[PDB]
Amino acid sequence: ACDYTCGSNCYSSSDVSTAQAAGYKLHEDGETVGSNSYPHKYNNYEGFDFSVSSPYYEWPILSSGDVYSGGSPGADRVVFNENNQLAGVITHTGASGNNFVECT
């Protein structure tokens, strides 16, 4: 069964921790990757009720199970905070425009 389901994409806990670790390292190093400069701040415009404190950052999680290294980041993101705590897994799939919904 999937720990998070983002549309048709199925992720386990280990998928999320792996993506999160890569993103947090770049954030700590003050480095970014990709044309959209990930990781970057996640403003929470959607008003998600995350159980950890802001500020939050987002980083792509990819269904191929590879770590994001540039190119298209697809629809799915992990959202982590300054303490490297996971806030949530969110996706553009199933939401209008460039909005997000949470993966379930």
Ligand X SMILES: Nc1nc2c(ncn2[C@@H]2O[C@H](CO)[C@@H](O)[C@H]2OP(=O)(O)O)c(=O)[nH]1
Would you count residue 98 as binding ligand X (CB under 6 A)? yes
Would you count residue 45 as binding ligand X (CB under 6 A)? yes
Would you count residue 36 as binding ligand X (CB under 6 A)? yes
Active site residues: 40, 58, 92
DSSP state string for 61-76: --TTSPPP-SS---SE
Would you count residue 100 as binding ligand X (CB under 6 A)? yes
- Cα–Cα distance for residue pair 16/71, rounded to 1 Å: 19
**Binds 69: which of ligand X, Ca ion, none (CB < 5-8 Å by kind):** none
Helix, strand, coil in percent for the chain, rounding step 5? 15, 30, 55
- Note the residues at the interface with ligand X (CB under 6 A): 36, 42-46, 58, 77, 98-100
